[PDB]
Amino acid sequence: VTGAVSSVNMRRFQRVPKVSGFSAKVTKKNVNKALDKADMFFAKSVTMEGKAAAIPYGVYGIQCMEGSAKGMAHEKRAMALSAAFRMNQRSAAEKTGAMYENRRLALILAQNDHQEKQYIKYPKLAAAALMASTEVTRACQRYAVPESIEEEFLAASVDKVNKMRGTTASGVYKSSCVEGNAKGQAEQARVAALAVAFRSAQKSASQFAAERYAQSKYGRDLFSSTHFEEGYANTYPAMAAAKRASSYGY
């Protein structure tokens, strides 16, 4: 049996930080690794408390179906995880644009000053609060139902503006708005989204009436600095439910 002492790398994790030296630099990078795990806990919390509104009474509502055919939930993981991989392939212009764009919108929906200070300090928490805010009050486009064909065209115009920021200034498609990753996965996405379009028309008479006023308020609070924009939000709520935060490319 040989005589093997503990190596030096096995002993460098027991050290004490000294700020006066260069050993401050390794406890730079030891700390933002922990402060991203903090953010991934913060966003995980704020996702779950909003997500608890889709099941208000212990029974799963029809808002969070995922799986109408036999393998539709197993491909949904492959959609979402590849989208999360491509989310951090953006360059330093887009990430720092999206962070400061989310800080203009999280700061106007927060009520107390600590809640706005939290979205200020942690950017993933501010990314998740904006999502959970549009999920519990269904002002997303995946739940917005137009009423007349007038308002359907009125929502199509805003959506055509929103798709244009999914391409570059040249006209080349950006890597954000992408609908496939493999062979036949875009067809799987097309079959997956029409079921959600049918599930949004199966709401109750109370839920349609609630999300009408929630969409008008979302339109006139976040994307209206003028009187004509809020006049459009007050009459066509589905038009107001098609304005994204612009942190998304699509």
Binding site: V145, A156, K163, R190, L194
Partner: protein
């Protein structure tokens, strides 16, 4: 999802609007009088 105008295949949002159910009240109200 995206509206039917751009990048979209088949027709959607087959849901009862208030105008259509107003017409369905009205046709019954006419039939009762007839």
């Amino acid at each position: 999802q995206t509206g039917l105008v751009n990048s979209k295949f088949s027709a959607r949002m087959a849901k009862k609007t208030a105008k259509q159910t107003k017409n369905k009240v009205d046709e019954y109200m006419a039939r009762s009088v007839q």
